[PDB]
Every structure is written in C-alpha cells, then in structure tokens.
Design a protein around this ligand. Sequence first.
Ligand SMILES: Nc1ncnc2c1ncn2[C@@H]1O[C@H](COP(=O)(O)OP(=O)(O)OP(=O)(O)O)[C@@H](O)[C@H]1O
Ligand SMILES: Nc1ncnc2c1ncn2[C@@H]1O[C@H](COP(=O)(O)OP(=O)(O)OP(=O)(O)O)[C@@H](O)[C@H]1O
Ligand SMILES: Nc1ncnc2c1ncn2[C@@H]1O[C@H](COP(=O)(O)OP(=O)(O)O)[C@@H](O)[C@H]1O
Ligand SMILES: Nc1ncnc2c1ncn2[C@@H]1O[C@H](COP(=O)(O)OP(=O)(O)O)[C@@H](O)[C@H]1O
Ligand SMILES: [Mg+2]
Ligand SMILES: [Mg+2]
Lengths: 259, 259, 267, 267
Amino acid sequence: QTLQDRDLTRPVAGKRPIRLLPWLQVVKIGGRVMDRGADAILPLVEELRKLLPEHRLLILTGAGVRARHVFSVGLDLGLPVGSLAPLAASEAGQNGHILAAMLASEGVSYVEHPTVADQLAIHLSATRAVVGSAFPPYHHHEFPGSRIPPHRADTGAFLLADAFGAAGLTIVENVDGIYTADPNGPDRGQARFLPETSATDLAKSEGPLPVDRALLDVMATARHIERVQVVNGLVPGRLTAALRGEHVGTLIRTGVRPA
Amino acid sequence: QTLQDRDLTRPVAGKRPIRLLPWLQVVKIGGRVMDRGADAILPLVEELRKLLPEHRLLILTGAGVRARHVFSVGLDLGLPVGSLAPLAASEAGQNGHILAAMLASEGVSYVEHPTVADQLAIHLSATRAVVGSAFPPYHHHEFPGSRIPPHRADTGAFLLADAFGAAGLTIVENVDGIYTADPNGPDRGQARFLPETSATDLAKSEGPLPVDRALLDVMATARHIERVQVVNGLVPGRLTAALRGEHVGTLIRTGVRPA
Amino acid sequence: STAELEELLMQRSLTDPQLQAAAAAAADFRILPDATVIKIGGQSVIDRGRAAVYPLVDEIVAARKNHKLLIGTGAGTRARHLYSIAAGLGLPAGVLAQLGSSVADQNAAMLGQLLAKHGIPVVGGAGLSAVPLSLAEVNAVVFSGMPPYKLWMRPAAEGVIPPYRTDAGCFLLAEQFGCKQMIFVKDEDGLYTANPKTSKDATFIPRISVDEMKAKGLHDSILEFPVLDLLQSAQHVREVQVVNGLVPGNLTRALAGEHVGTIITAS
Amino acid sequence: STAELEELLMQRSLTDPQLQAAAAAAADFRILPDATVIKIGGQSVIDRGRAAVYPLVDEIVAARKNHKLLIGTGAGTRARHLYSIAAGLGLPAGVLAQLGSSVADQNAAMLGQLLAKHGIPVVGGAGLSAVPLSLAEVNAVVFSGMPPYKLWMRPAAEGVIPPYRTDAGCFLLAEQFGCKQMIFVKDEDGLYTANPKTSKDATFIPRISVDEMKAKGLHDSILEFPVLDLLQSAQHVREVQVVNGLVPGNLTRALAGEHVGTIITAS
Ligand SMILES: Nc1ncnc2c1ncn2[C@@H]1O[C@H](COP(=O)(O)OP(=O)(O)OP(=O)(O)O)[C@@H](O)[C@H]1O
Ligand SMILES: Nc1ncnc2c1ncn2[C@@H]1O[C@H](COP(=O)(O)OP(=O)(O)OP(=O)(O)O)[C@@H](O)[C@H]1O
Ligand SMILES: Nc1ncnc2c1ncn2[C@@H]1O[C@H](COP(=O)(O)OP(=O)(O)O)[C@@H](O)[C@H]1O
Ligand SMILES: Nc1ncnc2c1ncn2[C@@H]1O[C@H](COP(=O)(O)OP(=O)(O)O)[C@@H](O)[C@H]1O
Ligand SMILES: [Mg+2]
Ligand SMILES: [Mg+2]
C-alpha cells in the first residue's frame, strides 16, 4: 500500500524457505511449570488431552530448577559452557519423559533429538502429538561468552518451529507473560505487564526476561514465525486459547513481515 | 554460477528502470578538446561525419578554458557555487553551437536542455545526431561544499546516458586516458597509464583526474551503463574504435552488474 | 592570492586538490542576506485546503512588513500519486522529477493567487529573474519548491523516487542566496523520536544536530534525508527550523528568530 | 561466593544480569590444555587428493610424538554441491546443516584410514567419548569438523547456507576443551588483502586483529565470518593461526608455536 511497495525497481525479498511441517503447532512447556509437580502438571495434562483432537502438536519441555542445580555444581567445578549445555539439556529431556508418560494412553511418546530432526513427519502421521526436549543439541559446540549456556529451551523450540515453518509456537510459563521487571524479584512492586512487544524492543532492554535472550536473536533471523505468545500454564484454558490465537498473555513480534 | 546465485531465498535485485533510448550512443566532447580550435576540431568533425551513418548520436560538449576564466572572475567577485554553475554550463553550450554548426550540412543542430530532456526521441527520428550541452541544468541548485561546481560535463553526460539507458557513453579527452597523476602536471614524470579501472577505486584515490569526481559518485548509483571509455580525441580513429567497443583508452567500470 | 588561484584554474584540472583548496579561500558573497526562505508543506499544509492555508496567508501578509520572504511550495499527495504510477512502470528518477515539479507548480499557483491582491507574485524560470524586484517592492515572492534537475536528477541508491524533492529545492535556494534563515512549515510541532502521527508516545525533540539525527535513525524522518547532507556541506545556511504551520503565530515567531519548533544544526 | 551464585541460580531467571555476572566469576577449568586442534581444509586440502594429503599425513605422524592433536576435517566441494541442490529447492539452513556434516564425515573417514595403522582413530558421537583415551595413548584423533546443530542450526541473516560450518566446528572444540592453540591448515600462506587466487597483487598479512579484519572488509575471507565473533567471545582460545598445508613443515612449525602463517587475534 506504500509508495515503496509500488516501485518495480526496488530489491525484492527472497522467497521464504519451504515449510517442512506447515500444519504443526509447537508448544514449549517451561521447566519451572513442570517443577510445580502434580498441582500444575495434572491440569496441564488434561488440557493437552483435549487439544490432541484439535491440533497436531510437538510438545517441547524446558529444564527448570534441576538445570540450575547442575549449573551450580558444574560452575563450582569450573566447567565451561559447552559442558554445562548438555547437562541442562538432560533435564529438559527428563521433563519430556515425565510429560509423555502422563499422555502415553493417548498414544504420545517422548522422542530423542535425532528423531525430532529427521523422523518427526512419520511419527506425527502415526499419532496426534509427540514430546521432545526443547533444548537444542549444541553440546560441546555451545557458543562461548556467558558461562551460562545461551541456547536454551525457548531458543531451541523457536529454532525448530521456524525451521519447520510451523503454524505457531506458544510458550507456556509460570507467569502471565513478560513484565518490565521480574514479577517475583526484588523489584516486583515496579513490574508492569506487557501485553505486546517486539523482539527488537526486548533485545535493546536490559534486565531479566522469562525467555532466553538468544530467543530474541534467533527471532531476528526468523523466516516464518511472526509472533510467539507467552501464556500462563497455571491458568487452565490459556494454552487452549493461545493455540486459537486469542490474546491471553504476552505476544512477542518476531519482525518477520506478513503480507 | 556461484553458490549464492543458486540460493532461491536470497533477496533479488530490483528490475532496472525502463530504457528510454536503448539504441542511442552518447559521446561527450571535452571542452579542452574544443579549445584547441581547428587543428583538433576539423579531424574530429570528419570522424563524426563518418560515424553518422553507423550510430545514432547524442553529442554533448564540455566547457573548457572559458569556464575557468568565468570561475576566476566569479570567485574574485565572491559568487557562490550555484552562481558559477550556470556560467560554466553556458560555455559548454557555446562549444555545442560551434560543433553543431560544423555538422549543419549533415542535418545536425544543437538543442537546448528542455529539448534534450523532453523531445530527444522526435529529433533523433528526424536526424542521425544532435548536439547538446553536457553540463546539467542544476543552476541555482548546484550542491554546496566545493566552491567549484561539482556536477559538470562528464557528470551531466553520464546522468543523461544512464537515465536514457543508452547503449554507451564515450568520453573524448585531450589525453590517452586516466593516469596515476596529471600527465601534464608537475609530477608527470611519475604518471602511469591506467588501461582499466573501477569507479570505486578512482573514488578512494586522491589527486587529479581527467573526469569529474562526481562522475564516480553517479556511477555508483547507475542502473544501466556498465563501462565508460575515456579516449584521446586528438588521435583520429580512437572515437570510432571506442564506439565499436575496442579498447583504445581507459575503461572505467561503473559497478553496474551485467548478467 | 588571486594570481595563484587564477594560475591553478588555467593549468590544472578542476579535480586537482590544490585548485579546490585555492577556490575554498575565495571571498563569500551573500546575494540576499536579509531574506528568509520558507517552505509551505504540500502534503502537510497546502493539501489541507482552506483551514490550513488561509491562516498562513494572513501570517505571510502580516510578516512581509518586517521580513523579506521567498515562499516555496511542496508538492504532496498528487506527486505521490504520479510517483506511484511512474514507479510502477519502472520509469527512472529523471522522468519522475518532472512529474513532481508540475505538482509543486500547481501549489505555487494556488498559493500565489491567494496573495496576488497583496502584490506578491509567483516567480519561475531557470534564472528566477523576477525575485530581486519583487523582494525589494512587496517583500515576498512565491516559487515552486522542486529543484530543476529534471532528467539529470540524481537517483537514490535504490528505487526511482527522486531523492531531492521540495525540501532540497527550498533549502538549496536559501543556501545559494545566502539567506539569513530557512524555515520549514509543516503540520507537526517539529521532530519527534518517532512519527507522532503513528506513534503512541514519541518524544518531542526541540534541538538536534545532523549527526545526532543519523545516530537515532531519524535521517529520513522530518526532512528528505539528503537535506541533512546538504546542510552539512552548506556555506551559508548551517541550521534550519521546522515549525507547525497549523498553530497560529509559529511562522511569525520563527521569522523573528524565536525557537518555536525543532532547530536542526549542521554541527 | 559459591553461596551467592547458588542463591541467584535458584531464585532468578538465567537472563538476570546479576546471575550472569556471578556465573562469570566462576573458576575456569581447561579440559585438554595440552592438546592442539587442527583443521585440515576440505576444499583446500582433502579435496586435492594424494599430493596434498600424503605429506600432511607424514607431518601428523611425526608431530604426534611431541604434540597431542585433535584433527578436524573440512567438507569442501561435495558439501558445496549439496548446498547448491538444497538451496535451489529453498530448503532451510537446518536441513542443509546435516548435508554438510555427512561430507565432513566422509573426509574424516578417508583421512582416518590413512592413519589407522599408526593407531590414530576417527572419533564421533555426541559426547566424543573416545577422545580422552586415544589422546593419552596415540596422541592424536580425527574428528568431523561440522558442528552438530543439524535442524537447530542458526541461519544467516540472508539465505539458507549454514553460517557455522567446519571452521566454527573445529574452533568451538578447541575453545570447549581449552586447548593451547587452534591451527587452520589451508592452501595459502594465510590472509591477504584480497583473495590471492583471483587477485593480481594482494598483500600478505601476517598478523591482524578481528576488528582490523572487519574494518578492512575481510570478515568473510579466510575463515567463516562468525568464527571471528566466536573468537572475540572465546574464554580459552583468544587467537588462531592459519597456515599453508601445501608447504612442507608449516604445520610442524606452527605446532611448535612458530609464527609461520597469519595469526588472527581476538583483540
Ligand atoms: N521481565 C520478566 N517478566 C516475567 N518474568 C520474569 C521477568 N524477569 C524474570 N522473570 C522470572 O522468570 C520466571 C520464569 O523462569 P524461567 O523462564 O527460567 O522458567 P522456565 O521458562 O519454566 O524454564 P526453562 O527455560 O528451563 O523452560 C518467572 O517466574 C519470573 O519470576
Ligand atoms: N590522473 C589524470 N589522468 C589524466 N589526465 C589528468 C589527470 N589529472 C589531471 N589531468 C589533466 O586533465 C586534463 C583534461 O582536463 P579537463 O578534464 O578539465 O578537460 P575537459 O574534460 O576537456 O573539460 P570539460 O570538463 O569542461 O569538458 C588532461 O589534459 C590532464 O592534463
Ligand atoms: N520522527 C518524526 N518526527 C516528526 N515528523 C515526522 C517523523 N517521521 C515522519 N514525520 C512526518 O510525517 C509525514 C509523513 O510521514 P511519511 O513517513 O512520509 O509517511 P506518509 O507520507 O505515508 O504519512 C512527513 O511530513 C514527515 O515529516
Ligand atoms: N583475502 C583472502 N586471503 C586469503 N585467503 C582467502 C581470501 N579470500 C578468500 N580466501 C580463500 O579462498 C578460498 C575460496 O574462496 P571463496 O571466496 O570461498 O571462493 P571459492 O570457494 O568459489 O573459490 C577459501 O579457502 C578462502 O579462505
Ligand atoms: Mg521461561
Ligand atoms: Mg575531462
């Protein structure tokens, strides 16, 4: 609609990569949600059960508190970031094993990262959902800089969702969304809820977020996913509403153009 | 042929602007060539006469020494660069009137800049060549910075040639081409001839050139003209050879991609 | 040394750094030092019709008792439509330049007819020959704001939209004539940290340098981005002021040298 | 304070700057401090066959008496062909990553079979479990140089070619293991001011910082451009050396710490 759009002689955006699983919905479950045990997991499992006939789901679990513990031990031992990364990824895997077992009677199993990378299409033809680790398998090849592995569960799940060209990625958190400060931290009195934000805005900000800061970097190079909603999985129905695109938490705009 | 060429997802260059006069050859005659009088002009006129049945020609004249004189007076009077620009353009016009008169019996006339901008297609359907001023009509709106008008004869002629999408622009000089130093200046002992150069290379260099430095800037934004040859019009046959693409002087690459 | 400059002018190429430096030492004459150049926005003012133009006509008539005004017009919506047609065809920037010029001419004619009964003419022609007499006698002239580059318009790095339009046209006339100031009349108070029309909470900026604008990503915001570079190269007009012509008195105060909108400085 | 770090790790997000700064103060353990990582170029060395590989095999066998070597392989021409097929289809960088990995695997297998009779194994698997024993006993291992990102490969800003390839794969292993140095073995003396293969008179550069490379436009010249950024973020490997493996003795001298090609420094 803009004058620049009409200019026949301007450079044209390259085509987007082909979508591998365009009909797929990707759902990332926070490790800290899993950490709450049955009180949080059982309602979430019942909600997931009712979503299975509606959506085809890749359910990816984060790591939570146990990865903080293994970081504590590993850092005390002096281990580098490429040693800490697979130790944390292991905890995301264990959360996946637990969640899949709760859904086994529905035909849901956890699959390891080689199966996620290569055979997801066959398994999602067999069954309505599969569970995997949200951490990527960066292992020894995690990037240096921080002593804390940067490419964690949010980041892995987004890389997968965008590589697949999936229909969406929803991040299921133990808070309502992104605030201007840690809503559980020492400045929680100043915390303001952000219904909507862009990843570029979040990236310039300093301070804690409920999502990996590398998530914002991989959003900048994203090709398909236009928005990711962070919703509170401790409130039943918000995951369901988010998967239908209802605005029930924080919408992060990736900067991918729509048209 | 490169891996990047094959990448379907990379941005694609915008289409080029439509060519107004794609069959046209543009020839810029240096004012300092005209300044040599009959000894230079008469052989050049005979060469041009023989080119008329071979090419359709827009012949654009530069200004030469008289513009240096009017600059000398105008600068002594303190006049700004937008006052000096039309005074110099006038001298390029007078050289055009002289050259056209020498070719009048061949059907060649000088035309003013409104006719060049708007009615060139009709006139080149009437006759094989027309003469114009190579200076652009920037007048009061010449760019500030230097006290010497930057957009001069080379620059005007290239802007026209590239706007027309013409088949070529050949610059006819009183030297063989571009040297590493002024071949008539105090360092002419160190002057090395450059058969070929890129405009980006010339732009980074410091020191005098036989072409406007603004020529290199407008080459950077050029859309059609890929190369401009600077040839010695005091050597009969070099203009003729250059119009057939033979390498007889300095080739300047504009940086426009070919494919 | 007039002789060393004269000698270099005869013997060197105009590209010779020695000649260029000698020419830079020449005296600097201001042709209309007491005049002020005003641009009346095409899109921001003239396209808004009577409710915008009539109050500014009154200010201009009142102002020409104390100030000498060269009043340039923008082009606005009709030029945008012409650019969209011509760019959709792939016509080059040199062809579009002419199209924008005719719209700026339309707006100068319309503004000029509202001012004719006050003696104020519309002036044109390559030489602007009617300016000195009009300015001496009725203290104002109206001119069309497009530069006269036509087919010799320098294109942008990308696309065929002419990058030198009516901001540049007006600024370059102020610079050429060595006018005492350059005032851009628009429909916002001045420069904000974002487009105030589409931005929830953009912050007003009352003063900024060219370099500061570029660093903030505001190069192509309130003025055509090449005007910032012309401003830094300018010999005579080293700053500009943008004001809100929809607020009565802003132009008048600005003409008197008041800081009422955004002042943009070369340095 | 192990207690303040432990407390932040339990109570804050890992994105909290306070936690991040506390983690940065942790002790720094080097896992294989006496080992050296070498990359054997795929395109520049292994693709050249016997005349290139056999002399380097001899140097490796001689060198493993005085040095502990992790020898990574590039991928080269066959990966370029795979990338051209897959990119022409529009497949994403995550899919191409796997393709390049299999070519690097081929080259590690070929190099490894030339070294098997000297006891030197090819090692693989996510954990590289065979490295500690092989390194202690025969002082060398061969590994495939691609990072294991697969479908989780980070794409470049434009296009689908994986930006982290076998330079990055080898460099990151050197960094993770805290090796004493990282040597890239190619087919030119080192870095030049332009591609020495296509440039008439490029100038050899024996030492340069990352920032100096970027300022000279050499970011994506001799190494994959992201490796320069990894280098500046690196905790353990703060410089690298590129040498000409076609010249006998260059690798040997480099292993001994001699300045024989181009040294690229993080700072
Ligand atoms: N700006 C912020 N907005 C919202 N929450 C924040 C912010 N800064 C910090 N937090 C904290 O982050 C907590 C969530 O922690 P975190 O993201 O590590 O858990 P998770 O995503 O479940 O774990 P994992 O990444 O292992 O899956 C929230 O409960 C909140 O206390
Ligand atoms: N690097 C260089 N290479 C070649 N000639 C140079 C160089 N530097 C300076 N010159 C001088 O420039 C002279 C040509 O001058 P100039 O380009 O002003 O004339 P012109 O092009 O005929 O004039 P106009 O621009 O008015 O048409 C050459 O004779 C030479 O002495
Ligand atoms: N940051 C800003 N501060 C002040 N004015 C602005 C800013 N950005 C844009 N404008 C003004 O808004 C008007 C139109 O904006 P533009 O980006 O051209 O979009 P459009 O013309 O489609 O409305 C222009 O007059 C411009 O000067
Ligand atoms: N400035 C430079 N100095 C040294 N080597 C270079 C330079 N530029 C490129 N090379 C080397 O040339 C080889 C191939 O160059 P590249 O640009 O990838 O083109 P191609 O692969 O098509 O030959 C690479 O190994 C690269 O490291
Ligand atoms: Mg989280
Ligand atoms: Mg010349």
